[PDB]
Design a protein around this ligand. Structure first.
Ligand code: BCL
Ligand code: BCL
Ligand code: BCL
Ligand code: BCL
Ligand code: BCL
Ligand code: BCL
Ligand code: BCL
Ligand code: BCL
Ligand code: BCL
Ligand code: SF4
Ligand code: SF4
Ligand code: SF4
Lengths: 61, 123, 359, 119, 359, 359
């Protein structure tokens, strides 16, 4: 349970801290305009599942 | 003490019912900034196929970008209006020439963290 | 046991280049007014009709119907103000002043000149929204009051005698012109009233009866706070007066409190803010600084709702304080930050509340 | 140092300005006006605002679709694209400070000066 | 441990043409005084004992016994004020000023002239109870002080030297005269202090020793707010002074708060209001406007009781705010609206509270 | 409706003849600032280094880094102030003023003269701790701004033209020098700004480019409230500057609230009080009177802690308001009387809080 909480907490700390920008996207010069945007496309090896709605899914999963 | 005709103002505790309680501007892609996500392309009306794709390599290596065809663009400002662009490539030039990268920009600030001499956040 | 005040606001704006907005405001307050005579009630009416587009002239009317301690008081004004140049603005008008059984009429030929101590490009460049602009205003006045009453004659005879015998008339007239607390209002808004200058005090015959005539000229300077000086071009949207504009308001006051009703359309409610974005006109500073003078006498609780209605396709890009709720085209402000800003500005604060709405 | 993502635009690491018109005066001096990415104020490249560029507080760029860029940018841009929709490509050239000439554009391995560059 | 202040008031009036009323006031406040030095305590005594009915001359006395930051401070005045005309009023009196081990006496021959910028019949006819009266006052002063101490001798010279070497002495003397926040108070009550005029600064020998003699003149104008100007006839009921009248008050102040004790009888408490109706004298505006200056620094809850006692056969025709309770002849005010008006006027408000009592 | 503000204070003092004290202050407030532009942030830095003991000269620096409504604003000053005599004090310094893309530098040669209207021995003998001292200050200014920008030249040309064509330039310049609410602050602290006097406005060539030069001189008088005049000797502990002293502070402000941080050591924090007893320096009156101007717009709850640390062997003889708790040599103030005095002085009150600590 301790490991199972800290695991899904990672997806929650990311919703709280990276809703608009992250250290990586400030580096890649990008803005998370939206909460339900799927990916930015194939670019940078791809960036799928980066919105907070997707981070919500990875907390439920 | 005479007075003027009464003002009907029932705002507080009152038994009265309350009330319900042109091609001027131009748009462009900065190609070095674009990541080709195509969010702009889907805001363009399908009978005005202004935004389009341009390929020159593998997509996983930024091999594709978007661009507005000005010959068919009608300056409806749908791509810019919705704050779709995540990189700033989609920009707008006003009829007198200012370049806007985003529809509204937050104001600049200094930055410092406030601590306290004797509270929980000490020093 | 605890005082409370309730209020409702509403602004409806059109799209395109139109600066036209409809404003409605209802307020109800439970504390006594600072007026040393009660009850005092008052209704005001303003109507502006464009005479001709090329000239830029407009006809403005004003009616004041106020009963003060059972004393009927009425002031009526009809004038023709037009833009001569960027700093000069001439007005020709007539009006009537009635108190109880007394009344007297007047005709005036006047021009107002407005100059800014400096006009620098760097300010303009470095500033997107300038609030304070330092300046001064000069009024040329030619008053024409017929001496019909026995009292008018005596007020005129006395005035001429006073000028003749007292050297300090230009200075001590400012103690009369601003009666009771209006004089303290001068220092409060950072406004300096210069000494009046009497060009002439000559009696000229009129078909009705002898007409005392005064030709005077004065000046007054604003540290930047004064809106007449800082905003000279914005308070006269004559050229934007495509159709007639009217502002109608009134209020009731006594020991129990104040009831106020305000409504009317006029241009200039919306002004360009840069980058294709529109914005509600900056709040006038003089009214806030002038209300902090009477609004700091009773601890009160604020219940204010500000309903703003925007044009089709027009949404807000930014507002602080942020709207509590949005409902389709209309956006609502109530509670939280906004009912702190209302308590701020009802006590004399001038803190900025900005709404930017772009198409 | 640098402001955070929350202050101003988040994508930017330093404030961003775009030279929007390069008209000349009666004496032929190049009047450069650069507006910021937000775009609500007009500035000229004074020493105080160049001084920011020495420390990287701001960055200046020029679009290739500028009405008066003087140099035939489209032909050169079209050639490079063909080397490795081609027409409508637009780019942002990063203006840099050369102590000897002031603002220069390193276009195609050849330094240029704003007056030389613009019409 | 809450800002709370308790107060008690009392007015007893006689019948007939008598304007005589007894006033008692006690107050207790829990906030620190806006005084850079504490503790500061003070007792004041005023006695007016009439001299002859035909002349209209009266003898007024004043004693000030205040300890400020352990420094005993005394000021004593004995004067003979009489009515010369409607605008002139001459006073002859003597007094002594003691601070710690220092003391000096003075004798003065003075006259005050009070003129209203206008006097119109229409204002009198149409306004039954006017509050705001624009005017100016002129003081003629002949000060005479015996210089029997080294410290007093030094002050006498420096002044002459300063006048001789500084052209701006008439202007910069206003800065020294209104010590601390007293100067700020001038703008606050809409009162303008004009430049003093030194008729003469001559040393004249006296039997005791060299005596400094000064003969100066000054003026000051009121926008209407000032009670000395607006109410010149009402602050000197000399002719109504059949028996000696005395007002006695005192106060204790420190970090913990203020306790105030005031009591005394004098005429002018009741004035005719028209239509056979009497009324309590309009509240002085200057004290309220002057207390709003220090009363706006600590939030508080009011606990004030105002007991008013009327003459036999005399019942209120109207009061706002209305008396909470009515024990027949004696009426009581506490709570509700009245507590709302006390918080209003203790913070600088000047809202009207009128009581009309007819036989 | 009440908001909350949290604050912490700290004063550490050394023993012997040392007047050195360390002061740290943190504050956090939840009401909007009175500034009509938000957000407005600001960081200030002051450093004073002694150049030579015999001369008494010291080098003072000041940096202002403020962003106002996204407009970077910076003012830099480097000056050499020294004591010439009891009333004269000459300063030589250079500085830079930058707003957005605009910047201009300046060099000044200046002297300030401070005189007290009177200097009596009796006041000194009978009053152990005087607060109000009546006085006036005179500034001699020789500004040297190079006209590098196109705008500077135009501001200078315009200035010369204005002087040439307007007789009232000495008077109306005070409407420009004190912009917006700054004009109102003058009357508030009982401070009178006299008319400026232009000795000369001459353009003198410099190696870089034409240098507009201004040689002006002005004066200003304090009724006693002003600390620059009343305390001229205390605000410059140059001779007590054995080691460098620095005061560092900054603040963040917007619609939501204000955050303030202040820290630094400097001499003069402790001054002799008589009878072998030391005492914390009397609170400056001008800051309190100036903050009552913006601190009276929102009802607030106070949460302030004042930790005072004394030298070894040094114990308080007396404090009002009394310290809530004590920790050996450290004494604490919080709650009760102290959080009434804070509510008092944050709204403009100047009530005395005195601490006497003897060895
Ligand atoms: C209040 C601040 C200023 C002031 C501000 C201005 C402004 C601003 C201007 C005038 C100008 C004039 N002034 Mg002036 N004026 C002041 C003091 C005076 C005094 C005086 C008794 O001391 C006099 C005699 C005058 C005389 C005059 C006239 C010669 C002239 C036209 C007045 C008019 O038609 O009003 C009409 C009569 C009324 C009762 C109107 C009152 C309107 C109020 C003040 C605001 C209402 C507008 C509301 C906020 C928005 C309404 C929109 C609707 C479409 C109307 N001024 C003070 C010092 N004055 C005008 C000019 O330039 O002439 C060439 C003009 O533009
Ligand atoms: C405060 C507002 C006015 C003011 C208001 C008046 C009024 C009103 C008049 C005087 C008049 C006089 N004034 Mg003056 N006077 C002011 C400033 C000054 C200053 C000064 C230090 O600047 C000086 C030297 C003087 C000098 C003088 C005297 C020559 C003369 C009589 C004074 C006296 O006997 O007081 C006595 C000494 C005292 C300490 C009394 C203080 C009384 C206080 C102010 C009010 C107490 C009454 C209380 C509310 C009700 C009490 C009822 C009891 C029956 C007493 N004035 C200011 C500018 N002055 C008088 C005159 O006309 O002479 C011909 C007079 O009627
Ligand atoms: C604010 C009240 C007074 C004022 C108070 C004083 C005082 C006091 C004196 C000066 C003196 C001077 N004044 Mg002055 N001065 C005022 C208005 C002006 C104006 C103006 C714009 O109107 C000008 C141009 C000047 C010009 C000048 C200079 C010629 C000279 C040195 C200034 C300096 O180095 O500042 C340095 C630049 C700064 C930004 C410093 C600001 C400091 C603030 C005000 C207080 C900080 C101290 C803090 C509370 C404690 C810190 C301890 C640390 C060890 C520093 N004054 C007003 C009217 N002035 C000085 C003199 O005598 O020269 C011979 C001096 O001692
Ligand atoms: C306790 C805190 C209360 C509060 C306490 C009070 C109190 C107490 C009082 C008011 C008063 C007023 N309040 Mg408030 N008020 C509150 C909140 C509000 C709210 C709201 C919730 O939005 C509103 C709409 C109001 C509205 C008003 C007005 C009805 C009124 C001031 C009238 C005015 O503008 O005169 C404008 C006045 C003038 C223009 C001056 C006229 C005279 C001078 C001499 C003219 C010189 C100008 C010159 C001639 C002009 C130009 C001429 C032309 C150019 C020709 N209050 C808060 C919640 N308010 C005051 C009042 O008057 O009540 C009756 C008052 O005493
Ligand atoms: C020096 C501080 C201020 C300033 C202080 C004053 C003062 C003080 C006065 C003027 C006055 C005037 N100023 Mg200037 N002036 C400034 C700089 C300028 C600049 C500029 C390009 O910077 C301009 C265009 C002007 C323009 C003007 C004129 C409109 C007017 C005198 C002209 C006249 O009446 O004949 N000022 C600077 C920045 N100006 C006079 C006036 O009456 O203005 C209304 C006046 O009294
Ligand atoms: C138009 C503005 C005001 C006005 C403004 C002034 C001014 C300003 C001054 C006077 C002054 C005076 N006024 Mg006038 N005056 C007005 C109308 C009148 C009327 C009238 C019958 O209406 C009367 C009787 C007076 C009476 C008087 C005198 C008491 C006095 C000059 C006489 C003197 O000293 O020899 N005024 C109007 C209503 N009056 C002078 C004075 O000193 O008053 C105390 C003075 O300085
Ligand atoms: C928090 C809100 C509190 C409050 C907060 C405070 C605070 C805080 C303070 C007071 C102060 C005072 N309060 Mg309060 N007060 C409250 C309610 C009350 C109530 C009540 C409940 O009815 C009363 C009776 C009082 C009474 C008083 C007085 C004891 C005192 C002002 C003294 C005065 O008149 O000086 C009159 C002063 C003068 C006349 C000026 C003297 C000096 C000048 C230079 C003289 C020039 C005049 C000239 C020479 C005159 C004429 C000369 C003659 C003509 C010859 N307060 C409310 C509830 N009050 C203040 C005080 O002084 O406390 C000690 C103060 O700091
Ligand atoms: C609701 C009640 C709130 C409150 C409400 C507010 C509000 C509301 C505001 C502030 C503001 C301020 N508050 Mg507060 N405040 C509270 C309590 C506090 C406490 C605390 C708990 O101890 C602190 C530390 C502060 C601190 C502060 C500052 C950050 C700020 C004023 C800055 C300043 O000094 O400008 C000093 C200013 C100047 C020196 C003037 C500069 C311009 C003029 C023209 C210069 C002329 C001088 C001349 C040139 C000088 C000399 C030159 C040299 C001699 C050379 N507040 C209480 C609890 N406070 C105000 C602010 O500015 O916020 C941003 C504001 O609006
Ligand atoms: C609630 C506030 C406290 C108070 C708070 C303070 C504080 C705080 C301080 C002083 C200080 C002073 N106090 Mg104390 N003081 C109080 C009451 C008094 C009384 C008294 C008998 O009541 C006296 C005589 C004094 C005396 C004085 C002075 C020694 C000194 C100011 C120096 C100065 O320049 O003044 C000289 C006189 C004047 C400047 C004004 C002249 C007097 C008035 C304006 C006119 C008197 C007219 C009188 C009625 C005579 C009749 C007039 C006739 C026509 C002749 N205070 C009240 C009760 N006082 C200050 C100090 O100690 O500095 C050394 C200071 O910091
Ligand atoms: S998540 Fe993967 S497959 Fe889906 S759009 Fe993004 S890059 Fe393409
Ligand atoms: S303006 Fe309209 S048509 Fe043109 S590119 Fe943008 S969305 Fe497409
Ligand atoms: S939305 Fe932005 S990143 Fe996406 S294709 Fe358009 S310009 Fe490129």
């Amino acid at each position: 349970i301790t490991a199972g909480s800290l695991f899904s907490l990672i997806a929650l700390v990311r919703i709280a801290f990276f809703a608009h920008t992250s250290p990586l996207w400030d580096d890649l010069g990008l803005k998370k305009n939206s909460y339900s945007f799927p990916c930015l496309g194939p670019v940078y090896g791809g960036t799928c599942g980066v919105s907070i709605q997707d981070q919500l899914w990875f907390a439920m999963l | 003490k005479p007075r003027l005709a009464s003002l009907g103002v029932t705002l507080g505790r009152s038994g009265v019912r309350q009330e319900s309680a042109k091609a001027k501007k131009h748009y462009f892609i900065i190609e070095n900034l674009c990541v080709g996500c195509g969010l702009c392309l889907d805001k363009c009306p399908p009978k005005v196929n202004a935004i389009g794709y341009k390929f020159y390599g593998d997509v996983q290596e930024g091999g594709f970008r978007c661009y507005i065809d000005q010959a068919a663009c009608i300056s409806c400002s749908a791509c810019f209006s919705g704050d779709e662009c995540p990189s700033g490539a989609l920009i707008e030039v006003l009829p007198d020439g200012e370049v806007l990268d985003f529809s509204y920009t937050p104001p600049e600030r200094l930055d410092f963290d406030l601590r306290f001499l004797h509270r929980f956040h000490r020093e | 046991d605890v005082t409370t005040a309730h209020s409702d606001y509403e602004i409806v704006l059109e799209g395109g280049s139109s600066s036209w907005g409809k404003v409605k405001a209802r307020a109800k307050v439970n504390a006594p007014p600072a007026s040393p005579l009660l009850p005092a009630d008052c209704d005001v009416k303003l109507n502006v009709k464009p005479l001709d587009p090329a000239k830029g002239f407009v006809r403005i009317s004003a009616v004041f119907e106020s009963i003060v301690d059972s004393t009927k008081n009425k002031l009526t004004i009809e004038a023709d103000i037009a833009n001569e140049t960027k700093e000069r603005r001439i007005s020709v008008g007539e009006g009537m002043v009635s108190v109880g059984d007394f009344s007297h009429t007047f005709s005036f030929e006047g021009s107002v000149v407005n100059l800014f101590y400096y006009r620098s490009d760097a300010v303009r460049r470095n500033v997107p929204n300038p609030i304070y602009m330092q300046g001064r205003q000069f009024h040329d006045i030619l008053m024409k009051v017929p001496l019909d009453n026995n009292d008018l004659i005596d007020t005129w005879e006395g005035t001429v005698k006073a000028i003749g015998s007292t050297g300090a008339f230009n200075d001590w007239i400012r103690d009369f012109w601003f009666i009771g607390p209006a004089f303290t209002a001068l220092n409060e808004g950072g406004q300096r009233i210069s000494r009046i200058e009497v060009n002439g005090l000559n009696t000229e015959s009129g078909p009705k009866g002898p007409v005392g005539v005064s030709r005077w000229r004065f000046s007054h300077g604003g540290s930047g706070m004064v809106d007449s000086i800082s905003r000279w071009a914005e308070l006269f949207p004559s050229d934007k007066l495509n159709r007639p504009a009217q502002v109608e308001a009134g209020f009731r006051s006594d020991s129990q409190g104040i009831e106020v009703k305000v409504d009317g359309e006029f241009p200039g409610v919306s002004v360009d803010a840069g980058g294709g974005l529109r914005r509600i006109l900056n709040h006038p500073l003089i009214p806030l600084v002038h209300h902090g003078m009477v609004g700091k006498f009773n601890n009160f609780n604020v219940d204010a709702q500000l309903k703003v209605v925007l044009p089709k396709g027009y949404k807000i890009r930014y507002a602080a304080p942020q709207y509590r709720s949005q409902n389709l085209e209309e956006y609502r402000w109530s509670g939280g930050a906004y009912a702190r800003w209302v308590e701020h500005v009802c006590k004399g604060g001038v803190g900025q509340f900005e709404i930017l709405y772009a198409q | 140092a640098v402001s955070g993502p929350w202050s101003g635009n988040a994508v930017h690491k330093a404030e961003k300005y775009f030279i929007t018109s390069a008209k000349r005066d009666r004496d032929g001096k190049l009047q450069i006006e650069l507006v910021p990415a937000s775009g609500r104020r007009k500035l000229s490249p004074t020493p105080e605002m160049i001084r920011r560029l020495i420390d990287g507080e701001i960055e200046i760029y020029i679009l290739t679709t500028q009405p008066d860029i003087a140099i035939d940018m489209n032909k050169e841009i079209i050639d490079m694209e063909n080397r490795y929709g081609v027409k409508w490509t637009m780019r942002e050239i990063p203006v840099f400070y050369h102590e000897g000439k002031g603002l220069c554009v390193e276009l195609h391995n050849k330094i240029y000066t704003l007056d030389q560059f613009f019409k």
